[PDB]
Structure 1
């Protein structure tokens, strides 16, 4: 189809005729997004242009990783792809990638204190998206208010210091963390929507861990005997020991079912944290939970993550992924 060129805040854009009325939303290191009208579907869409997708092996692999993940994500509460395109006619020319999805209004950071029913529906949608993501053996690792797209209907999709929502095993740089790092982030988000304050606004990674242990208590011997690192065990055992606080006391006034769920998500031992699938069955989501509409994902191959390839190999794989793309109906 026919492409049209255009400059927007220094960034150049080459998009098909079907996308009209471009309009910068925001930009940064990874790339610029534009809002647009999709003439073919009647939809407002976001169009993300990647910054220099094949600058290096790192960039080429990151580009491939993002396109593969977005092509796989097919769920009401995870961002997926309406379209992917390049203005290039062959592999030799290919140097730009554009990604298209349903325009969302605002982030969960912008919507902020919410009422208990709003908190139930937003955390329900996150957990339903995370059940799907985790079922593919994907770990988000970066769940925070800014990575949650919400529209005026309170419909939520998974896409402010990052450390504030990070599980304590990532503060001390554990290399074998599991998917419940994401449940820790959900617990921190749910706290912040109930209270109107960051649960653990650490000034750095050391302060961040001290605020966490202040609420959840320093580890018992059951957790300490799973810490392989001698420096980390020495450090954690050398802190002044604080007990697990009563969550009923800290979240005074909240739904006791919200409090119970928070206790199940912010357990220090990652092996004892509630899973996304378990959390959806919790009494706090009785108004919203439906076990025949909480779907899992098709299996997801990320063996490419263990491969060391040339820039042009990552580039051609990415090109291959643009060409095989089938739009949703």
Structure 2
């Protein structure tokens, strides 16, 4: 039970172990505030997030428990991982604040831009490697986009969720609930990201859900008979057939002058039918990534138990489950 010190910044009490020194605000919003800090135990530079009113409602409490469970399980080089979690509460009774600690990321993908073909290969490779890992434990990101990707000076990437319109990167089946989905909603997003790096521009910059679909269908074409057969909703089916029939464009006439193996991968990623879309694992083995792919260093995750998600609990039960998870936390080795 280490020594805590208090201090105020951004109009909020921070109460942290002495281990963590020199705190400096880096951004706050509805969900939590974040500080950079020096970690006197590893000489490393870290980021500390104070959750905003984590047990105010049933939604907040369950969400707080979800983030903590998730970060405790993720142990992979291309995925954010949990260095430490603490509370200044001595007991469950007085337990009201949660703090999460991770490696301090510098600049996101949004900030670091066009760019070389070798750079795109390496950046997209690392995202897929990280996606193979989380998808293997049935975890879906759902909000993959450049501002959720951290990239340091070595060009090393990590997937995270700081919590660019999201809709610009969203799979059309999730955006509209028009057809069932799987893990490959995130594969759609990656294709939108890769295109952007290849050409310097947002691929599909829609101004609402309808305009977004319009732009997308302009590129991939209206759904064929095969895909139209699996659209569950009657409304959605009508809309689509009531549109004016757009053809599939030739991707080489769109990504003009780009590396042909990347044009090919883009075509396997940006397919409308989600039964046909390439997975993370299959995509690691494509010829675009020949210089990086090693099937013996692209690991999968331990089984992840997410049954809690179907439960309807009271606030005090989620709060108590969170506290347990704080107490059983064992740090990762140096």
Band the TM-score falls in, shorter-chain normalisation: over 0.9
Deviations 1:133-176 (A, max 9, x none): 10001111110111111111111100100000000101212473
Deviations 1:242-266 (A, max 9, x none): 1111011100011111100000000
Partner of 2:102: 101
Kindly report which structure 2 residues correspond to 1:158-237, keeping only aligned pairs within 5 A, or say none. Answer: 158-159=159-160, 160-174=164-178, 176-237=180-241
Q: Which moved more, 1:116-125 or 1:165-174?
A: 165-174
Partner of 2:47: 46
Structure 1 stretches of 4+ moved >2 Å: 173-176
Deviations 1:202-252 (A, max 9, x none): 000000010110000010001000001000000011111111110111000
Conserved? CA contact 2:178–2:232, under 8 Å: no
Aligned partners of 2:180 and 2:6: how far apart in 1? 46
Aligned partners of 2:309 and 2:140: how far apart in 1? 13
Shift of 1:32: 1.0
Aligned partners of 2:12 and 2:171: how far apart in 1? 36
Kindly report which structure 2 residues correspond to 1:48-197, keeping only aligned pairs within 5 A, or say none. Answer: 48-159=49-160, 160-174=164-178, 176-197=180-201
Deviations 1:269-321 (A, max 9, x none): 11111000000001111111110010000000110000000100000000000
Aligned partners of 2:312 and 2:238: how far apart in 1? 37
Secondary structure at 1:20 match in 2? strand
Q: Which moved more, 1:145-154 or 1:272-281?
A: 145-154
Conserved? CA contact 2:179–2:231, under 8 Å: no
Secondary structure at 1:25 match in 2? strand
Aligned partners of 2:195 and 2:6: how far apart in 1? 46
The structure-2 alpha-carbon separation of the partners of 1:37 and 1:175, relative to structure 1 and needing over 3 Å to count, comes to farther
CA-based RMSD: 0.8
Aligned partners of 1:117 and 1:195: how far apart in 2? 14
Aligned partners of 2:172 and 2:20: how far apart in 1? 44
Secondary structure at 2:194 match in 1? helix
Secondary structure at 1:235 match in 2? helix
Deviations 1:16-72 (A, max 9, x none): 001101111111111111111110011100111110000000000000000000001
Aligned partners of 1:199 and 1:11: how far apart in 2? 40
Aligned partners of 2:116 and 2:22: how far apart in 1? 36
In structure 1, runs of 5+ residues without a counterpart are none
Shift of 1:7: 1.3
Aligned partners of 1:298 and 1:174: how far apart in 2? 32
In structure 2, runs of 5+ residues without a counterpart are none
Report the count of equivalent residues: 329
Aligned partners of 1:321 and 1:255: how far apart in 2? 47
Secondary structure at 2:275 match in 1? helix
Aligned partners of 1:48 and 1:114: how far apart in 2? 32
Deviations 1:71-117 (A, max 9, x none): 01110001010000001111001111100011011111011211111
Partner of 2:319: 315
